[PDB]
Design a protein around this ligand. Structure first.
Ligand SMILES: *[C@@H]1O[C@H](CO)[C@@H](O)[C@H](O)[C@H]1NC(C)=O
Lengths: 50, 49, 49
C-alpha cells in the first residue's frame, strides 16, 4: 500500500518574501483638459452680426 | 504573466490529481482483494470448526 | 479582480487537497495496520485449530 507523500500541490504566491508590489495605476488621471481659445467665439460673433 | 503562471499551476494540480486517482484506484483494488481473501479464510475456518 | 478571485479559489482548493491527501494517508495507514492485525489473528487461529 503506497503512501501519498509525493503529491505536492503547488500554489501561486504562498510566501514570496512578501513582495507587495505597489502598482498604483493612475490611468484615470490621464485626461486632456484642453484650454479654451482667445475669445471671439460668442462675444464677437454676436456683436458683429451682419 | 500571471495568467500563464496560474495555468501552469492548474495543469500541475490536474496531473497530480490524475496520479492520485490512479494510485487510489490501485490501493482500493488491493484492499478489496485482501478483504475478499480474509472473508474466504473466515468462512473456511468457520466451516472447519 | 477576477484573476485575484480565481487565484484565491485555486489556493483554497490546493490547501483542501493537501489536507485531503494527509487524511487519506492517515486512514490508509490505519487500514493497513488493521489488515495486518486481522491476518495475524487469522494465522494464529488456523495454527491453533
Ligand atoms: C512542496 O515543495 C515546497 C518547495 O518545493 C516545500 O517548501 C514544501 O514543504 C513541499 N510540501 C510537501 C508536502 O512536500
Amino acid at each position: 500500500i503506497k503512501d501519498f507523500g509525493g503529491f505536492n500541490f503547488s500554489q501561486i504566491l504562498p510566501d514570496p518574501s512578501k513582495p507587495s508590489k505597489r502598482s498604483f495605476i493612475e490611468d484615470l488621471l490621464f485626461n486632456k483638459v484642453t484650454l479654451a481659445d482667445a475669445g471671439f467665439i460668442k462675444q464677437y460673433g454676436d456683436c458683429l452680426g451682419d | 504573466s500571471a495568467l500563464g503562471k496560474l495555468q501552469d499551476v492548474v495543469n500541475q494540480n490536474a496531473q497530480a490529481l490524475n496520479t492520485l486517482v490512479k494510485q487510489l484506484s490501485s490501493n482500493f483494488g488491493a484492499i478489496s482483494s485482501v478483504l475478499n481473501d480474509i472473508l474466504s479464510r473466515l468462512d473456511k475456518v468457520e466451516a472447519e470448526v
